[PDB]
Amino acid sequence: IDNSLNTNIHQYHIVGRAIPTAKDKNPNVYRMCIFAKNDTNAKSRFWYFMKKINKLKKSNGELLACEQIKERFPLRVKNYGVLLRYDSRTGTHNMYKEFRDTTKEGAIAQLYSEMAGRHRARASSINIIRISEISSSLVRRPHIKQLLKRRLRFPALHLPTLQKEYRKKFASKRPSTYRM
């Protein structure tokens, strides 16, 4: 239960094979990791890739395993690099982008948020090919490179946003945006 609120989307290891036949008595086993909102969606995404890659379809295959993946440490930061193929209005484009997070799932959430925000690209039009941990020295993006410096601080960059109780319509004196 916890008390925890925001942000959800999960990681699944799915394994499947072609249905056994007289013609082939030892089907090829195919495995993939898939980021999805649930197991049924994860199976469908696996099937879409199985259909695109192989000539296998749900009617001609069998599930060997499907199991949810949990990240090794929830609170230790890693730099995840993700390679995407996405579709524009005209056609197809490739991108490999870098995200600092404690979770691969969080990095995918940032990626979907970026693809939506910077290109107006819909979830349907994205294909994730590999998300993996990248060393600090190796990183291309300057926005991730800046985080990786020796020392970091800010004088508070964010406006207040008090609880509903204290968002009342009238104030007694003029306030300030933030303390110095």
């Binding site: 394994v15 094979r17 030892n26 090829n28 086993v29 195919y30 495995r31 993939m32 890739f49 199985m50 695109k52 890659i53 192989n54 069998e62 060997l64 390679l83 193929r85 197809t92 484009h93 490739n94 294909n127 994730i128 090919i129 590999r130």
Partner: protein, 155 residues
């Protein structure tokens, strides 16, 4: 409308590839007559007792046979009703139907199953399979026999 008899020549009446004058001996000799179901198929050779367009590839019961003619009871939809029509066709046009052959083979096989069960005084069902949902199974998989898939970059 403006509808003469053989309209749709280039469609239905067009011959099968390299099939000319096929008239060999075995074609004639089938004999199940008054009870039988029979398909009505066009012959490129024979114009003499060729059916009307609608009856092509349709199936129905033989109700009367003559020297080389066959009466066939065929179903036709006429607007709001499907009705039985007495189609006169020739021996070259009639092809023995195979639906009867499925029923017969199943009857024979089931009869053998019944006969086997009866000898043992067994209680068992000779009814057809449903092709039901698959049960549990097992496979042992080494690291060598499992392949990692991923989507493809443009190439």
């Amino acid at each position: 409308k403006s509808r003469g008899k053989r309209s749709g020549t280039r469609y239905k009446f067009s011959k099968k590839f390299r099939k000319h004058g096929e008239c060999t001996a075995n074609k004639y000799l089938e004999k199940l007559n008054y009870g039988d179901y029979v398909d009505i198929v066009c012959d490129s050779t024979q114009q003499k007792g060729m059916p009307f367009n609608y009856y092509h590839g349709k199936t129905g019961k033989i109700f009367h046979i003559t020297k080389r003619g066959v009466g066939v009871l065929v179903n036709k939809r006429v607007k709001h009703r499907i009705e039985q029509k007495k189609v006169c066709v020739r021996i070259e046009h009639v092809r023995k139907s195979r639906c009867n052959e499925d029923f017969l083979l199943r009857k024979i096989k089931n009869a053998e199953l019944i006969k086997e069960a009866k000898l043992k005084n067994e209680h068992i069902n000779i009814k057809r399979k449903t092709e039901g949902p698959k049960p549990a199974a097992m496979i042992k998989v080494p690291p060598s026999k499992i392949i990692t898939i991923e989507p493809l970059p443009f190439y």
